[PDB]
Design a protein around this ligand. Structure first.
Ligand SMILES: Nc1nc2c(ncn2[C@@H]2O[C@H](COP(=O)(O)OP(=O)(O)O)[C@@H](O)[C@H]2O)c(=O)[nH]1
Ligand SMILES: [Mg+2]
Length: 249
């Protein structure tokens, strides 16, 4: 009785987002790609589940303030028009004051005979933190995966609609928060520091909350003004298309 699931969530996205999303995917189909596997890593409570639930369009993955449990990666697979998109929602990687290696390989296991196209690294925008337990996370990642991971990676900051209190210019605030994070990755995963500049990772901002508010065509927009879901897949898409090796060997 099961083959996969009909992306009922898509029919749910506003028109401008539907037709925009139909474009990006149309690209892969033509490049002989009728599937896309996205992974999602990061610390707990950053907004992995919230975001995935956002992209697919339904309540697939469960969100939670206390994301101290979980402990087993779930894959979400929806299809339509002959195209299949799947996201792997990985459990938090920080387990009480430190990286959780138990689960980190539990992830490395979930994907043994698989192929990854895009990896999403999430953290929160509303954080001003010089997080270095952070620097740890960035290491463990390169430890399990490695060289290919960051080239096929993307940085997502959630709570993209965080009004920086008492001091301004969300743009002056956003970058410092993006830069450092990028900086921690260029530096943390030792390989990249000079070469980092060679390819560049890039960032995408997201606002999963139901209070995000809209725009002309009723699609979740950022303060910046554009739709984050639509342009977010654009990114997952460009990365899925650029022919680097993929999480391999
Ligand atoms: N990602 C995200 N979470 C938000 C946002 N606004 C509020 N939240 C809250 O932060 C929590 C994130 O939970 P979840 O995504 O499950 O964390 P995960 O463990 O990384 O998957 C939710 O319970 C939301 O109530 C937002 O813009 N983005
Ligand atoms: Mg989760």
């Amino acid at each position: 009785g099961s083959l996969v699931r009909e992306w009922v969530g898509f029919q749910q996205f506003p028109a401008a987002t539907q037709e925009k999303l139909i474009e990006f995917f149309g690209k892969l189909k033509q490049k002989d790609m009728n599937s896309m596997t996205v992974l999602v890593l990061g610390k707990g409570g950053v907004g992995k589940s919230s975001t995935v639930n956002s992209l697919i369009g339904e309540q697939v993955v469960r969100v939670s303030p206390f994301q101290a449990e979980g402990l087993r990666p779930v894959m979400v697979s929806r299809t339509m028009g002959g195209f299949t998109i799947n996201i792997i929602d990985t459990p938090g990687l920080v387990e009480a004051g430190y990286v959780n290696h138990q689960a980190l390989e539990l992830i490395k296991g979930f994907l043994v005979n698989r192929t990854i196209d895009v990896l999403l690294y999430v953290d929160r925008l509303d954080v001003y933190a010089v997080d270095e337990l952070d620097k740890q996370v960035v290491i463990a990642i390169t430890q399990t995966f490695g060289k290919e991971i960051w080239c096929k990676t993307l940085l997502v900051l959630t709570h993209a609609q965080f009004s920086p209190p008492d001091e301004l210019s969300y743009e002056t605030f956003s970058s410092k928060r993006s830069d450092s994070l990028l900086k921690t990755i260029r530096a943390g995963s030792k390989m990249r520091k000079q070469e980092f500049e060679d390819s560049a990772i890039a960032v995408v901002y997201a606002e999963n909350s139901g209070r995000c508010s809209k725009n002309d065509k009723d699609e979740k927009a950022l303060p910046n003004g554009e739709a984050w879901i639509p342009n977010l897949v654009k990114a997952i898409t460009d990365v899925a298309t650029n022919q680097r090796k993929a999480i391999h060997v």
